Amino acid sequence: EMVRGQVFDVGPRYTNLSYIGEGAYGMVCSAYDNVNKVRVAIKKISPFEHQTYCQRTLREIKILLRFRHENIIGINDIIRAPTIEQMKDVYIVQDLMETDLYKLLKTQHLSNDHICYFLYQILRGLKYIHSANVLHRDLKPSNLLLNTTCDLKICDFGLARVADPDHDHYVATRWYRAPEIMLNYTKSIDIWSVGCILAEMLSNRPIFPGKHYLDQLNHILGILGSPSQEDLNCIINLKARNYLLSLPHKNKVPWNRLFPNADSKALDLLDKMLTFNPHKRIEVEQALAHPYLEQYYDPSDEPIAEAPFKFLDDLPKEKLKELIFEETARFQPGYRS
Numbered sequence: 607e608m609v610r611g612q613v614f615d616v617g618p619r620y621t622n623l624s625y626i627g628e629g630a631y632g633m634v635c636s637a638y639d640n641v642n643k644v645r646v647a648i649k650k651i652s653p654f655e656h657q658t659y660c661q662r663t664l665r666e667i668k669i670l671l672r673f674r675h676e677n678i679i680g681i682n683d684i685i686r687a688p689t690i691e692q693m694k695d696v697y698i699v700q701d702l703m704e705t706d707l708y709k710l711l712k713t714q715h716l717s718n719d720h721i722c723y724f725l726y727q728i729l730r731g732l733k734y735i736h737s738a739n740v741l742h743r744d745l746k747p748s749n750l751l752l753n754t755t756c757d758l759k760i761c762d763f764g765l766a767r768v769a770d771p772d773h774d775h776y777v778a779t780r781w782y783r784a785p786e787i788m789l790n791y792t793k794s795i796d797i798w799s800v801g802c803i804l805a806e807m808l809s810n811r812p813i814f815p816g817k818h819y820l821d822q823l824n825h826i827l828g829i830l831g832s833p834s835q836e837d838l839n840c841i842i843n844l845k846a847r848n849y850l851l852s853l854p855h856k857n858k859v860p861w862n863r864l865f866p867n868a869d870s871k872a873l874d875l876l877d878k879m880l881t882f883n884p885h886k887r888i889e890v891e892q893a894l895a896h897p898y899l900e901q902y903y904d905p906s907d908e909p910i911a912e913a914p915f916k917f918l919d920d921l922p923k924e925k926l927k928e929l930i931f932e933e934t935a936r937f938q939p940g941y942r943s
């Protein structure tokens with residue numbers, strides 16, 4: 607019941623606990639699941655003090671319970687107190703994943719074969735996600751869990767949103783942030799993130815590691831070159847245009863110069879994913895159908911969602927608490943309807 611001076615309390619079903627790390631709002635352990643007779647991961651989540659924590663928790667739970675896909679982490683079980691007032695923590699049980707792409711990239715240079723199949727698995731999961739009209743919004747190496755080269759699962763849907771092109775209208779990770787987000791809710795933002803992930807696999811370093819959002823745009827233009835007038839016009843803001851229109855002119859760095867050892871087909875796909883103008887950026891199905899992925903592409907083995915997803919939110923943390931209580935009742939004794 608105790609791990610490192612803190613209560614876990616997932617028993618009696620989950621025992622033989624072993625600390626593995628920290629997450630958003632609490633520790634993560636591996637545990638022995640006595641029912642399924644296998645070790646699992648359990649995240650302890652304590653979001654109730656802060657409204658935003660409650661939002662991400664509710665969002666991730668609602669989405670993950672509805673998605674069912676081999677490249678997306680599932681939720682196996684949810685532990686919580688019998689009464690709301692007693693509910694201070696939520697324990698989310700999921701398949702144990704050995705590591706993630708962020709940890710992996712710190713220790714290994716990936717072969718072209720491994721990059722190719724990792725990329726396929728990411729886009730296969732993304733295809734399902736986008737077919738449900740959902741945007742992940744925070745794709746990055748630490749959100750790609752791994753057991754082996756053939757076993758990748760996208761995780762952390764705490765920031766996911768239903769796609770909504772007309773909106774307008776908390777941030778997603780700067781280095782993986784699409785230029786349109788900084789310059790003015792579309793599927794294209796996830797494709798950009800995946801492109802940053804592909805570039806990172808090719809060289810073991812973030813392609814665009816900006817310090818702040820203007821520095822981020824600077825890194826992007828530093829490689830793609832100064833934006834064209836056509837791409838410049840499609841900026842709903844003034845700043846940009848003006849404001850850079852206001853900086854030195856920059857030429858496009860050729861991808862093969864930036865990545866001299868990379869497969870030319872990988873670089874061709876990378877080029878389509880990392881295009882400034884989101885309207886011209888490659889879409890998920892197109893990316894799966896790219897020659898780089900032709901040895902894997904198989905629409906008959908690439909499930910999509912049954913029904914498009916529909917859940918807005920400026921709700922106080924007390925109303926969200928009840929909603930988390932409702933979504934998790936499923937896993938309680940005596941649940942009906």
Ligand SMILES: Nc1nc2cc(Cl)ccc2o1
Pocket residue numbers: 626627634647679700701702703704705751
């Ligand atoms: N599913 C899952 N497996 C995990 C393993 C670690 Cl080390 C951390 C978080 C995890 O989440």
